[PDB]
Design a protein around this motif. Structure first.
Motif: not given
Ligand SMILES: CCCCCCCCCCCCCCCCCC(=O)OC[C@H](COP(=O)([O-])OCC(O)COP(=O)([O-])OC[C@@H](COC(=O)CCCCCCCCCCCCCCCCC)OC(=O)CCCCCCCCCCCCCCCCC)OC(=O)CCCCCCCCCCCCCCCCC
Ligand SMILES: CCCCCCCCCCCCCCCCCC(=O)OC[C@H](COP(=O)(O)OCCN)OC(=O)CCCCCCCCCCCCCCCCC
Lengths: 167, 83, 141, 74, 90, 56, 114, 57, 165, 458
Positions: C64, C67-68, C70, C72-75, C77, C79
């Motif tokens: 789900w 919060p970002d 975050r 796997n899809w959408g980078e 920063m 981690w």
């Protein structure tokens, strides 16, 4: 996450896991208030282990026997056809290069397209004026003032304020 | 193929006020704020839309749903309502 | 042209607290359960200070995760723990380890001994002795 | 548009709603029943039947065998 | 929560306003531009099926006389003896 | 007897005609699900003919 | 199998000052979105987590490496191991076939192809 | 959007067009016209049978 | 067999498009929610899927399990193939008993639609050919092999009774 | 070649002699005119053999092989103009001349008539390719890869002069492959083993093995501007055909020691395919694919007995067009995203729908769709080594199964969503990007119409 709201994350899914198994509607509806009497065991008490042992025995019989292929509400994180609309997939700003006689159609749409950009072209005299001010040093989640103290434009302008609509 | 506008949800959020037999149909229509009417009054009040709408009701939807029109506000952002 | 801590170095005990995070913020202040101690076991060609492995793992699973982006899809920063095995892999379901499928495949392992038997239709079994008499014994007359 | 008005269904028959009477030995009791009794009652108790309804009510299952048989027959 | 109250009030005056902007079709805005431009069942099928009949049959009549193996049709499968032969069978 | 399998080769040829008309060589005013359905519609009776000669 | 995966544990009140580990990333997220939102970028983000990923994986493993352990010399049991074994299969092959091809015959007589 | 041929509902049992039900009714009968050839004329085993074939003497 | 499920997925496809997003056996209702025709189309297919008493594939399904009389099998095979004839039959009523039988329940704004003669042309063309599938093709065929022609007492048609239970 | 080297050397005093930016349109214009002269005088008949004129040409009689050598120079100039136009004009024209000079030695090579002119032409390369790696390449760690590009090929090729002159002074003269009628046999010794060893090992330096091949993902990884000489490096690797010239004769009967070249190229075949499913580089992704089914041809040659020369003739040009086309895909999608790392390319297939067809048919030549020029030869490698033994189908068949995943492992990486980034990468696949992307399958499936010319003696 806190201990009191940890009850709430289980309470919605306690009944949401049950309607997967039911066959009628009232059969599920009769067990709503019937399961509520177990929730009405400790109504209001202290926040110590007496409230944790009500949850420490909610480890078993909640994960134990949990949702044999439940309802998924297909537009969801899981479920079939959750991200099916991808032949369109809303390519917002794929419309930079046109080399016209292809930009012939929608004349008034492009005349309004460059209009909204001045709201984004002129925001950093206001948004960056508070971006150095609203963040104390390096702290928490960085939304601005939701009115930006005079006019909130957006703060998230414009990729979030003109975000992708679904179809 | 059938579209949808703003007037459908303005029926249903006001209707479930009277559908739930604990809440009489004499409250305020769109802003009752739910404290004048812990669990089962922030989850059960939207457990009926779990049955009717039921798009899984994420974790941030609880703390916003006090203002009963602020319930209605973000659905048009989710359901992509007209104009 | 990024030269300052451009990669990992010969760790993992060259003042490991000054590794994370003077750069390569895998840990916040070297106590985040992701300080660059986890050089598996070194000596090999594994990862050194390596902003890399035994950090919390086994899935980025496209959750789900609002919060970002975050998941796997959408980078998100910085981690990075491990990659190139996870775009097709997941977390734990409701059942557990029990290899009942070999017992489920053992259902024919009893009938694998039945593959040695014969399948003539008529007559019935009468399995007591040689009175069944399968083939030809005598002549015409 | 304005079809779901309140005080419309107002659960009257609905033998499915006898389970709300079943909890009277415990007491819950009033709120609420109209969710599960939204579309059970009315003409929503049409209640398509058993093996006869997969014969479609014996309406056409054995119609034309006695009318076709038979003539000539000499 | 009282913090996001001023949030999502101006956003509806921006996002749905952008969707009010996105709902935009001035007099069916196709130009197209320039330029322009059942019962028959006369040539829509005649170009479709009736023309390639003669070409491929010519490709078989001009094929048997050239290739030494033409169509290799099988035996007669005849139980009596018939008029194509001279003898009969019981 | 030559037309026993000749109609099969006609059946094995007209499938290419919606593909030959994909090259925008004076193509039909588009109606392409309709045009394909018509292209299948005449092959069936062509396919029906040599089945009768085989069973004889 | 892989895994349990231990999605629940205890709290209240283990490590009260452990929170705000999101303050590490939300500062980067504020540094992300401020870089992401601008009127003219026209290019990709540098994203040094992928810079430090491949170059410390494709390269800088041989400067890390030393043969100071036999579990680094353990690759002898995987590289040259089966490579002898296929020849140990194949040297037993092709000669037993040849002796039946030299002494005696088994083939069909119409084996022109081959 | 463009057409209102079938109305939206709120669980009031929106009615049919009363012309699909004729074709629905017709092919519920010609399938049970085919109960003719099930028995008439067709049996379970038109073969004959064996008298437990004993009499070898 | 080729007649069957290209009808059936398409006949069930109009049901899913009618609701436009659940595709679950949950939340379906009864058969008669102004749904006359496609419910008649399913019971043609579902009764054939019980194991063919005299329906579409009767001249193929029956002449094989009764050709298992004379065989040389494992004899675990006839103790495994014939049991699934019931398991094939219980597939039929499962969509009757859960999508076509009970009280109407599924979410609101009931936007059902069954009026498109494009779909009506497809369904009518199949079921005319579907019912006469095994009964015209096998009616005229040159024979190839020898039939069984012996199916004794307690050994003949009880796989139909397996479908009944 | 009567006059084939003769017109193309006159193309060289035309680059710096010409005007300004006219030098691109002029150089491509003359170049295609030679392509008909290649087709015309060749492709003649044909029965053992066409000794062409004299001591400098045997006309490439048994294997034509020379048409493919001449497509590339009017094919890379349109490719190299992506990122080259930033320098002085006199420096850019030198980069044009060195690639044209690369073709002229290779025009005399592949025919070569002899063996003492072969080796000087076999080593006549590696001078222009090395300079391309040094100047106008990419970022650093070039110079060690330039040294690894030397010191292997030169390391192995020097015993050929130890071998060949040892043959020239012993039995006749190796000027003529057709005066090789008298050939003495070679028995098993401790001197003759090395005689076969130096005769073979230099040819394993170019077409690689599971050993000694670390240099190959350096020149393709650290590579010039946008696949410029990388396309020429495809022909540089497949152009080690000369084993077909030599070991057809000149100790043929030593097959007792063939086995460690059979086995090493076989378990290394199945291994190096799976050595790249966790690779993080695009230009390295095609590179390890180009090892595997290029290592397929070696067991087709050391195993003798045709129905093996048939497919091996075609398998040289199999990836020779295909991997050249894949590098054209990889040379694109780099002028728009200035890093070659594949993971950053999420969210494709929507911005560029026109080249998305070209991704499909290119990777459909690795699954290879049996009416093509790829699976018409791989069936004959099956047809040969199954007569060797019954085990050989196993390891060779899984090679057809690993690259099934390994090709579609790239195709699915194009399909993702919302792309997170990319206010750059706007350009919707201009004319140079797709016309150069053509002319690869356009002769390839054309050759699949009547594939008669792609056949050895054989
Ligand atoms: C305004 C109107 C204008 C009027 C125009 C004129 C009217 C039309 C002209 C008439 C037809 C000529 C065109 C050729 C096609 C038909 C060929 C044929 O069947 O006759 C046999 C006839 C053979 O001659 P033959 O006297 O019967 O016997 C000689 C041989 O021994 C025979 O054996 P073989 O050696 O030829 O071997 C057979 C095979 C072998 O040939 C090959 O495949 C070799 C070519 C590839 C070699 C590898 C190259 C790799 C580099 O040949 C074929 O490939 C035949 C397949 C069809 C032709 C291939 C088309 C290629 C494009 O013609 C040929 O096959 C010659 C092939 C030349 C191909 C020319 C293609 C021209 C296309 C023009 C563009 C049209 C586009 C239309 C688009 C419309 C919208 C979609
Ligand atoms: C190590 C070098 C091995 C050379 C050993 C000596 C070989 C030799 O003496 O020559 C063998 C033979 C000629 O000598 P002979 O036995 O007397 O035959 C009658 C003619 N007089 O016949 C020959 O001339 C054979 C010529 C080929 C052998 C020389 C090349 C072998 C070395 C190539 C191995 C690969 C390269 C390794 C070095 C590069 C990598 C660092």
């Amino acid at each position: 996450l806190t201990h009191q709201q940890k009850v709430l994350r289980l309470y919605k899914r306690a009944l949401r896991h049950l309607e997967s198994w039911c066959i009628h509607r009232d059969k599920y509806r009769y067990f709503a208030c019937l399961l509520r009497a177990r929730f009405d065991e400790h109504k209001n008490e202290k926040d110590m282990v007496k409230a944790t042992q009500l949850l420490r025995e909610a480890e078993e019989e909640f994960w134990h026997g949990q949702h044999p292929q439940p309802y998924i509400f297909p537009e969801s994180p899981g479920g079939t056809s959750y991200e099916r609309y991808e032949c369109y997939k809303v390519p917002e700003w794929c419309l930079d290069d046109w080399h016209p006689s292809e930009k012939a159609m929608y004349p008034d749409y492009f005349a309004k397209r460059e209009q909204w950009k001045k709201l984004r072209r002129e925001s950093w005299e206001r948004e960056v004026k508070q971006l150095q001010e609203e963040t104390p040093v390096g702290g928490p989640r960085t939304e601005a003032l939701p009115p930006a103290r005079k006019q909130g434009d957006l703060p998230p302008l414009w990729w979030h304020i003109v975000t992708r609509p679904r179809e | 193929a059938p579209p949808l506008t703003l007037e459908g949800i303005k029926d249903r959020v006001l209707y479930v006020l009277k559908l739930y037999d604990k809440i009489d149909p004499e409250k305020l229509s769109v802003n009752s704020h739910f404290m004048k009417d812990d669990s089962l009054d922030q989850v059960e009040i939207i457990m009926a839309m779990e049955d009717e709408f039921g798009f899984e009701i994420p974790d941030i939807d609880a703390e916003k749903l006090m203002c009963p029109q602020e319930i209605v506000d973000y659905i048009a952002d989710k359901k992509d309502v007209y104009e | 042209a990024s030269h300052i801590t451009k990669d990992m170095l010969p760790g993992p005990y060259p003042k490991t607290p000054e590794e994370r995070a003077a750069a390569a913020k895998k840990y916040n202040m070297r106590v985040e359960d992701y300080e660059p101690y986890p050089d598996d076991g070194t000596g090999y060609g594994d990862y050194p200070k390596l902003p890399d492995r035994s950090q919390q793992e086994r899935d980025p699973w496209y959750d789900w995760d609002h919060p970002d982006l975050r998941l796997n899809w959408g980078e998100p920063m910085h981690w990075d723990l491990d990659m190139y095995i996870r775009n097709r892999v997941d977390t734990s379901p409701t059942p557990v380890n029990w290899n009942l499928m070999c017992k489920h495949l053992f259902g024919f392992v009893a009938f694998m001994l039945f593959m040695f038997w014969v399948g003539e239709t008529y007559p019935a079994y009468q399995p007591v002795g040689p009175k069944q008499y399968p083939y030809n014994n005598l002549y015409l007359e | 548009m304005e079809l779901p008005d309140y005080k419309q269904w107002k659960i009257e028959g609905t033998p499915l709603e006898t389970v709300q009477e079943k909890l009277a030995a415990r007491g819950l009791r009033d709120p609420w029943g109209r969710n599960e009794a939204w579309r059970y009652m009315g003409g929503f108790a049409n209640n398509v039947s058993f093996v006869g309804a997969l014969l479609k009510g014996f309406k056409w299952g054995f119609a034309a065998f006695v009318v076709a048989i038979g003539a000539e027959y000499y | 929560t009282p913090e996001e109250k001023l949030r999502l009030q101006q956003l509806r005056e921006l996002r749905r306003r952008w969707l009010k902007d996105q709902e935009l079709s001035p007099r069916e805005p196709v130009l197209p531009p320039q330029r322009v431009s059942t019962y028959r069942h006369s040539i829509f099928a005649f170009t479709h099926v009736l023309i390639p009949v003669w070409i491929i049959h010519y490709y078989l009549k001009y094929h048997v006389t050239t290739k030494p193996y033409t169509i290799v049709e099988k035996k007669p499968r005849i139980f009596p003896g018939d008029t194509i032969l001279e003898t009969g069978e019981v | 007897m030559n037309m026993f399998s000749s109609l099969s080769l006609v059946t094995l040829l007209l499938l290419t005609m919606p593909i030959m008309m994909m090259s925008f060589n004076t193509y039909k005013p588009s109606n392409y699900p309709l045009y394909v359905k018509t292209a299948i519609s005449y092959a069936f009776i062509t396919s029906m003919i040599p089945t009768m000669m085989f069973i004889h | 199998t892989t895994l349990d995966p231990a999605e629940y544990d205890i709290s209240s009140e283990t490590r009260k000052a452990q929170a705000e580990r999101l303050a590490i990333r939300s500062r980067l997220k504020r540094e992300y979105q401020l870089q992401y939102y601008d009127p003219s970028r026209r290019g990709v983000i540098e994203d040094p987590a992928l810079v430090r990923w491949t170059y410390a994986r494709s390269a800088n493993i041989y400067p890390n490496f030393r043969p100071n352990t036999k579990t680094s010399l353990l690759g002898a049991l995987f590289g040259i191991g089966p490579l002898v074994f296929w020849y140990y299969v194949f040297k037993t092959d092709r000669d037993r076939k040849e002796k039946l091809i030299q002494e005696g015959k088994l083939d069909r007589t119409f084996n022109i192809s081959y | 959007g463009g057409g209102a041929h079938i109305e939206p509902r709120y669980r009031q049992f929106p009615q049919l067009t009363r012309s699909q039900v004729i074709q629905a009714e017709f092919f519920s009968a010609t399938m049970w016209f085919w109960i003719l050839w099930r028995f008439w004329h067709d049996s379970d085993a038109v073969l004959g049978h064996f008298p437990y074939p004993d009499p070898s003497q | 067999h080729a007649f069957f499920k290209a009808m059936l997925f398409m006949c069930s496809g109009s049901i899913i498009h009618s609701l436009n997003d659940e595709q679950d056996i949950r939340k379906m209702g009864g058969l008669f929610k102004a749904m006359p025709f496609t419910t008649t189309a399913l019971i043609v297919g579902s009764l054939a899927l019980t194991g063919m008493p005299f329906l579409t594939g009767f001249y193929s399904k029956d002449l094989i399990i009764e050709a298992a009389n004379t065989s040389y099998t494992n004899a675990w095979a006839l103790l495994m193939t014939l049991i699934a004839t019931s398991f094939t039959a219980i597939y039929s009523t499962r969509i009757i008993f859960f999508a076509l039988l009970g009280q109407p329940r599924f979410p609101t704004l009931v936007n059902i639609n069954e009026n498109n003669p494009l779909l009506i042309n497809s369904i009518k063309r199949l079921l005319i050919g579907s019912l006469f599938a095994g009964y015209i093709i096998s009616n005229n065929i040159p024979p190839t092999t020898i039939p069984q022609m012996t199916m004794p007492y307690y050994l003949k048609t009880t796989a139909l009774i397996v479908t009944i239970l | 070649m009567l006059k084939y080297i003769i017109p193309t050397i006159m193309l060289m005093p035309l680059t710096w002699l010409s005007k300004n930016n006219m030098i691109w349109v002029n150089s491509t214009a003359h170049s295609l005119l030679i392509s008909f002269t290649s087709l015309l005088l060749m492709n003649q008949f044909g029965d053992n053999s066409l000794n062409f004129s004299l001591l400098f040409f045997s006309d490439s009689l048994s294997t034509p092989l020379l048409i493919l050598t001449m497509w590339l120079l009017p094919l890379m100039l349109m490719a190299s103009q992506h990122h080259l136009s930033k320098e002085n004009l006199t420096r850019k024209k030198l980069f044009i001349t060195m690639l044209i000079s690369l073709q002229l030695f290779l025009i005399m090579t592949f025919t070569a008539m002899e063996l003492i002119l072969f080796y000087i032409l076999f080593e006549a390369t590696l001078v222009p390719t090395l300079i391309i790696i040094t100047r106008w390449g990419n970022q650093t760690e070039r110079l060690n890869a330039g040294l690894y590009f030397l010191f292997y090929t030169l390391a192995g090729s020097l015993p050929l002069l130890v071998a060949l002159i040892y043959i020239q002074n012993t039995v006749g003269s190796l000027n003529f492959l057709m005066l090789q009628y008298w050939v003495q046999p070679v028995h098993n010794s401790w001197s003759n083993v090395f005689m076969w060893l130096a005769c073979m090992m230099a040819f394993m330096v170019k077409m690689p093995l599971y050993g000694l091949h670390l240099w190959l993902p350096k020149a393709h990884v650290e590579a010039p501007i946008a696949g410029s000489m990388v396309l020429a490096a495809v022909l540089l690797k497949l152009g080690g055909y000369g084993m077909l010239r030599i070991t057809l004769i000149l100790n043929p009967m030593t097959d007792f020691m063939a086995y460690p070249f059979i086995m090493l190229s076989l378990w290394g075949m199945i291994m190096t395919s799976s050595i790249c499913l966790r690779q993080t580089d695009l230009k390295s992704l095609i590179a390890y694919s180009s090892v595997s089914h290029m290592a397929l041809v070696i067991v087709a040659i050391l195993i003798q007995t045709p129905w093996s020369y048939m497919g091996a003739t075609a398998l040289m040009i199999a990836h020779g067009l295909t991997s050249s086309m894949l590098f054209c895909l990889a040379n694109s999608n780099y002028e728009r995203i200035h890093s070659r790392t594949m993971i950053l390319a999420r969210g494709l297939q929507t911005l560029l729908p026109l080249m998305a067809t070209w991704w499909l048919l290119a990777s459909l030549t690795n699954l290879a769709l049996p009416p093509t020029i790829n699976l018409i030869g791989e069936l004959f490698v099956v047809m040969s080594t199954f007569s060797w033994s019954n085990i050989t189908i196993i390891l060779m068949g899984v090679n057809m199964v690993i690259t099934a995943l390994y090709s579609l492992y790239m195709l699915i990486m194009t399909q993702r969503g919302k792309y997170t980034y990319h206010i750059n990468n706007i350009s919707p696949s201009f004319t140079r990007e797709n016309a150069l992307m053509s002319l690869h399958i356009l002769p390839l499936l054309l050759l699949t119409l009547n594939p008669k010319i792609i056949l050895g003696p054989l």
